Design a protein around this ligand. Sequence first.
Ligand SMILES: Nc1ncnc2c1ncn2[C@@H]1O[C@H](CO)[C@@H](O)[C@H]1O[C@H]1O[C@H](CO)[C@@H](O)[C@H]1O
Ligand SMILES: [Zn+2]
Length: 47
Amino acid sequence: GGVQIVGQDETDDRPECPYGPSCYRKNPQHKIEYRHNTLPVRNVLDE
Ligand SMILES: Nc1ncnc2c1ncn2[C@@H]1O[C@H](CO)[C@@H](O)[C@H]1O[C@H]1O[C@H](CO)[C@@H](O)[C@H]1O
Ligand SMILES: [Zn+2]
């Protein structure tokens, strides 16, 4: 199985959709031009 958030959807070069979690639009370029979740997935320790 696997129900974790290790990547979400390849969002390393995305700015930030203004709608956010309540985004009712689903276009092909809208999921690649902006991102809906700004969670940390790379810098959480720095060693
Ligand atoms: N909750 C919510 N999410 C996304 N977009 C939303 C929205 N509430 C309203 N909008 C957009 O604003 C205008 C109002 O003038 C609506 O027509 C919505 O426009 C959406 O439609 C397109 C994609 O289907 C986009 O232009 C998006 O803005
Ligand atoms: Zn959006």
